[PDB]
């Protein structure tokens, strides 16, 4: 999967021979939950690695255990790049070149804000409806949800969480200084501040 080129291929049998003989299959998966949590969790051992592999290794390709098989091929290709440079094949990518730098402007940032806020609403809406089932029991049949809904939204929730995060400049992700107050002295400044 890495490469069919013989010169590059001869530098991988070494690495292969040293470790693949010691660890068989699926026991490395066991070692993750071992190394993660020190203290006997026997059942939990396998399952912790599932959490770690799926929620950390390349989450842009997938989150289910079936998606692993795809990242597999992907991970190989990434590794290849490293090995050839030690043999000399390319020229180190300078990270200040504007081809590999992209700006996330005001549009895309506000999406990340709206997503978390809308998530909190849906979660608060679920709990409320459940806490209205035991004390009210049965109402009119097809108009159960059609009233359960409106009583259990309290709209102010989504609204406030949008303002207070944008007006203080401390976003939920951890970034700060996202919003500044528009510097208004002498026309040239405002126009300059917008860019």
């Amino acid at each position: 999967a890495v490469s069919d080129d013989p010169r590059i291929q001869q530098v991988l049998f070494d690495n292969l021979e040293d470790a693949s003989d010691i660890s068989t299959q699926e026991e490395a998966l066991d070692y993750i939950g071992r190394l993660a949590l020190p203290g006997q969790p026997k059942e939990y051992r396998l399952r912790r690695a599932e959490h770690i592999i799926d929620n950390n290794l390349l989450p842009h390709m997938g989150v289910d255990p079936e998606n692993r098989r795809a990242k597999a091929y992907y991970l190989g290709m990434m590794a290849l790049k490293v090995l050839e440079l030690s043999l000399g094949l390319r020229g180190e990518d300078d990270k200040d070149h504007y081809a590999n730098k992209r700006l996330k402007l005001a549009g895309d940032l506000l999406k990340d804000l709206f997503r978390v806020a809308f998530g909190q609403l849906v979660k608060d809406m679920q709990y409320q409806m459940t806490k209205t089932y035991q004390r009210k029991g049965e109402r009119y049949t097809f108009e159960n949800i059609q009233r359960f809904v409106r009583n259990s939204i309290r709209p102010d929730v989504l609204s406030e969480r949008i303002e207070h995060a944008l007006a203080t400049g401390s976003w939920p992700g951890g970034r700060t200084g996202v919003s500044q107050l528009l510097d208004r002295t002498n026309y040239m400044s405002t126009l300059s501040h917008l860019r």
Binding site: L121, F142, V149, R150, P155, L158, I162, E163
Partner: peptide, 12 residues
Amino acid sequence: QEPVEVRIGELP
């Protein structure tokens, strides 16, 4: 049986 349109709040 019955879609209901309901407001959620306010977006700047």
